[PDB]
Structure 1
Amino acid sequence: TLEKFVDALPIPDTLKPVQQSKEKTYYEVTMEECTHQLHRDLPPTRLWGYNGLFPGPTIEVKRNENVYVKWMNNLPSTHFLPIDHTIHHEEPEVKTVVHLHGGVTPDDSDGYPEAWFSKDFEQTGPYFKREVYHYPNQQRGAILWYHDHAMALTRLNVYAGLVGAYIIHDPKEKRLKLPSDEYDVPLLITDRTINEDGSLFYPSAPENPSPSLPNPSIVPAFCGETILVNGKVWPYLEVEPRKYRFRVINASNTRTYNLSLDNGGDFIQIGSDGGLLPRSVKLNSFSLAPAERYDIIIDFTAYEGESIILANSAGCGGDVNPETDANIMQFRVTKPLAQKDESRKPKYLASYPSVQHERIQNIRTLKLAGTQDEYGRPVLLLNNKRWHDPVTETPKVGTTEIWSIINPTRGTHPIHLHLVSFRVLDRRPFDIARYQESGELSYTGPAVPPPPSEKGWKDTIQAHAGEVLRIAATFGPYSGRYVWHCHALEHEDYDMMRPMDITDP
């Protein structure tokens, strides 16, 4: 296997605006097929990248900054990864649309899966309205990220390399003196399988495919043989002996990570998907499913000279392998201090979400289910509805709902709602067999409130097997057509995604 920790961690450059005034910031980002070396010992890999980079440029904005991004497709007319033509029913082969994950965004700038476009916008999907997306950024400071969201192609376009970081800085948070600038570093984690010739491998069918299966065929899960951070295989990062802030993003298709430091050191979590936690949390490990973000401080002050592995204990399709996927990256505490560490790790960070006292307008019960298709493949469904079925999740703008998510399946699903961030209320285990036979919900234990890591704002949430997860969301400030879905991309594409209409009655 590839030798670990021989390439330095890339830190994507921050994107520069094409035009900027006090009133408007304007960016242009063009999707390009390019080649990049992913490891010292590999030939360059053909990838799809925003501005031809993998990951894409980091975009940094201020809270309330009036931002526009013209996302453009300049990709080849043929994909290089295997397309399954049976999962969606003349359209172009390569369709793209950019979604700002976590963005409080008007609906026509949200990257609806059917708002896709081909090269130069030559062909556009039925929900396409505009070329230049508008991000008003009227939301809490947080780690966001942007990625492709095209109908029935999301798992492929994201795997190809179409992911990047987007950070909203709220100037009100500056007084906290959290590690900043060079000491504030995004970590986009993506698992990949790479052929000897350097080319990406993505499966064209399940292992030992039934003769009944189409070719190519979608698979329900992808587990990569190798882990990359910021577009390099098992990299090292030279750090100063001081406090760093890391914006940890799971940009993988399926894989969940459970992260720790191999010297037994602690993380201090300061933020979740939706921004700063009300109080900092000391953690020895944390779970990170697709699309979740952790905003953490690691304090290297006492560890000068040491090499510390960011390790992983979560399996993907089996037990973790000590020599491969148990490793994410390596910190080397060998960079001389550039200046005094004047950063802080404060306990008191932000207002509790619980200060809010919104009236519960609706309690929405939702189930994670699915069926089997004519080929014998599993089709994962929210409420046993297809993406194309008439909309059923129709919250009213400005109102608050409790969503009760029932998971009788064998696995976790990282459920994501567009537009909003939400509070986690509790998780409660239930009798799966009884639910499957009668549809009746019989609890097998008391409700468990969220751990401190989940006492802030979330937008992607692990709904574990055999549990009912309750979340509370206020639907706004915008009305329009959004979505909600499982963020395991293999599930999302077939067919665990539903429209979500926020109505203005």
Structure 2
Amino acid sequence: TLEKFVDALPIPDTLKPVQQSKEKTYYEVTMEECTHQLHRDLPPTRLWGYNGLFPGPTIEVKRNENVYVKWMNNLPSTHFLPIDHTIHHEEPEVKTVVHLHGGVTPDDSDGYPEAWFSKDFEQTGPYFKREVYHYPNQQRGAILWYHDHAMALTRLNVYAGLVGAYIIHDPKEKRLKLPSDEYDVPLLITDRTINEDGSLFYPSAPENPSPSLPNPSIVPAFCGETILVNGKVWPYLEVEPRKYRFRVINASNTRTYNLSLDNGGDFIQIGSDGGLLPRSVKLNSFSLAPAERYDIIIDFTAYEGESIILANSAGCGGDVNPETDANIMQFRVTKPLAQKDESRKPKYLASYPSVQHERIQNIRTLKLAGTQDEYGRPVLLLNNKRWHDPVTETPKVGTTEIWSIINPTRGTHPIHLHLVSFRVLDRRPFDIARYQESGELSYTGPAVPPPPSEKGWKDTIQAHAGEVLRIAATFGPYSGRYVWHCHILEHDDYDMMRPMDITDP
């Protein structure tokens, strides 16, 4: 296999505005097919990238900054990855739309799956409204990320390389003196399988496919043979013996990571999807499902000269392989200090979500299930409703709801809601067989409150097998048409995604 830790970790450049004033910031981003070397020992790989880069440029904004991005498609008219034509029924083959994950965004700038567009906006989807997306950024400082969200193509377009980081800076958090600038580094983790000739491999079908299956055929899961960080296979990063802030983003299709340091050292988590935690949390390891973000501090002060592996213990379609997928990246504490470490690791970070005392307008019971198609494939469904079925999740603007998510399947699903960040209330185990046979919910244990990592704000949440997960969300400030879905992209595309109408009565 490819030799680990021979390439330096790239740090995506920060995107510069095309136009900027006090009143408005204007960006242009063009999707392009490009080649990049993903590892020292590989030929260059054909990829799809925002501004021709993989990952895309990091976008940095202030809270309340009036930001516009014209996302443009200048991609080839044919895909290089295998499209399954049977999962969705004169349309172009290549459709794209950019979703700012975690964005508090007006609905027509949110990247609705059916607001897609082909090259130069020549053809557009039925929900398309506008070329230039509007991000008012009227929300907490947080790690966001942007990726393709096109109907029935999300798993392919994202795997092709259409991902990037988007950071909201709240000037009020500057007094905390968290590590910043060069010492504040996004880590976008993507697992990939790469052929000897350097080309990306994505399966055309399940292994030993049933003759009943079409070709190509969507697969229920994808597990890459290699791990990349910031577009490089198993890279190393030279760090100062100093505190660093890392914005950890799982940008993988299916794979969940469970991260630790091979020297037994700790992380300090300061933030989740929705921004700073109320209190910092000392951690030895953490689980990171697709689309989850961890804002963490690693203190290298006492580890000068050392090589430390960011390790992974979570398997994907089997046990983790010590020589491959058990490795993420390597820190080398060999960079001379550029200046005094004046950064801090404060305990008191932000207001508790529990300070809020909103009235519960509605309690929604939702089940994770599905059916089988004419080809024998599993079709994963939220409430046994297809994407095209009439909308059922219709919260009222400005109201708070508790969503109770029932998972009677054998796997964890990272459930994601657009627009909002939410509070985690609790998880509680139930009798699966009883539920499957009768629909009766019979608990096999008491409710478990969230760990300290989930006491802040979340937008993507692990719904474990055989449990009921309860979350609470205030739906707003905008009304309109959004979505909610599992962020395992192979599930999202077929067909574990539903519309979500926030109404203004």
Q: Shorter chain as normaliser: what TM range?
A: over 0.9
* Distance in 2 (alpha carbons) for counterparts of 1:502 and 1:204: 37
Give secondary structure in 2 for the equivalent of 1:209.
coil
* Distance in 2 (alpha carbons) for counterparts of 1:246 and 1:323: 24
Give secondary structure in 1 for the equivalent of 2:388.
coil
Give secondary structure in 2 for the equivalent of 1:155.
helix
1:62-115 per-residue CA deviation (whole Å, 9 max, x = no partner) reads 000000000000000000000000000010000000000000000000000000
* Distance in 1 (alpha carbons) for counterparts of 2:383 and 2:323: 40
Cα distance, 1:43 vs. partner? 0.1
* Distance in 1 (alpha carbons) for counterparts of 2:353 and 2:264: 31
1:273-302 per-residue CA deviation (whole Å, 9 max, x = no partner) reads 000000000000000000000000000000
Matches within 5 A, 1:461-476: 461-476=461-476
Matches within 5 A, 1:298-447: 298-447=298-447
Cα distance, 1:495 vs. partner? 0.1
| Dislocated runs of 4+, deviation >4 Å | none
1:310-352 per-residue CA deviation (whole Å, 9 max, x = no partner) reads 0000000000000000000000000000000000000000000
Cα distance, 1:255 vs. partner? 0.0
Cα distance, 1:232 vs. partner? 0.1
Cα distance, 1:353 vs. partner? 0.1
Cα distance, 1:376 vs. partner? 0.1
Aligned residues: 505
* Distance in 2 (alpha carbons) for counterparts of 1:409 and 1:155: 21
Cα distance, 1:32 vs. partner? 0.1
1:407-450 per-residue CA deviation (whole Å, 9 max, x = no partner) reads 00000000000000000000000000000000000000000000
* Distance in 1 (alpha carbons) for counterparts of 2:288 and 2:333: 25
* Distance in 2 (alpha carbons) for counterparts of 1:260 and 1:318: 19
* Distance in 2 (alpha carbons) for counterparts of 1:288 and 1:248: 9
Cα distance, 1:146 vs. partner? 0.0
* Distance in 2 (alpha carbons) for counterparts of 1:153 and 1:410: 25
* Distance in 2 (alpha carbons) for counterparts of 1:413 and 1:287: 13
1:205-243 per-residue CA deviation (whole Å, 9 max, x = no partner) reads 000000000000000000000000000000000000000
Give secondary structure in 2 for the equivalent of 1:158.
helix
Cα distance, 1:305 vs. partner? 0.1
Cα distance, 1:197 vs. partner? 0.1
Give secondary structure in 2 for the equivalent of 1:182.
helix
Aligned position for 2:46 = 46
1:134-193 per-residue CA deviation (whole Å, 9 max, x = no partner) reads 000000000000000000000000000000000000000000000000000000000000
Cα distance, 1:132 vs. partner? 0.1
* Distance in 1 (alpha carbons) for counterparts of 2:220 and 2:55: 25
Cα distance, 1:22 vs. partner? 0.1
* Distance in 2 (alpha carbons) for counterparts of 1:339 and 1:53: 31
* Distance in 1 (alpha carbons) for counterparts of 2:450 and 2:430: 17
1:366-395 per-residue CA deviation (whole Å, 9 max, x = no partner) reads 000000000000000000000000000000
Give secondary structure in 2 for the equivalent of 1:402.
strand
* Distance in 2 (alpha carbons) for counterparts of 1:52 and 1:317: 32
Cα distance, 1:124 vs. partner? 0.0
* Distance in 1 (alpha carbons) for counterparts of 2:337 and 2:28: 36
Question: TM-score of the superposition, structure 2-length normalised?
Answer: 1.00
Give secondary structure in 1 for the equivalent of 2:453.
helix
1:29-53 per-residue CA deviation (whole Å, 9 max, x = no partner) reads 0000000000000000000000000
Give secondary structure in 1 for the equivalent of 2:495.
coil
Cα distance, 1:246 vs. partner? 0.1
* 1:211 correspondence with 2:193: no
Aligned position for 1:66 = 66
| Unmatched segments (≥5 aa) in structure 2 | none
* Distance in 1 (alpha carbons) for counterparts of 2:242 and 2:45: 35
* Distance in 2 (alpha carbons) for counterparts of 1:485 and 1:314: 23
RMSD: 0.1
* Distance in 2 (alpha carbons) for counterparts of 1:359 and 1:499: 24
* Distance in 2 (alpha carbons) for counterparts of 1:201 and 1:489: 16
* Distance in 1 (alpha carbons) for counterparts of 2:180 and 2:52: 27
Cα distance, 1:23 vs. partner? 0.1
| Unmatched segments (≥5 aa) in structure 1 | none
Give secondary structure in 1 for the equivalent of 2:173.
helix
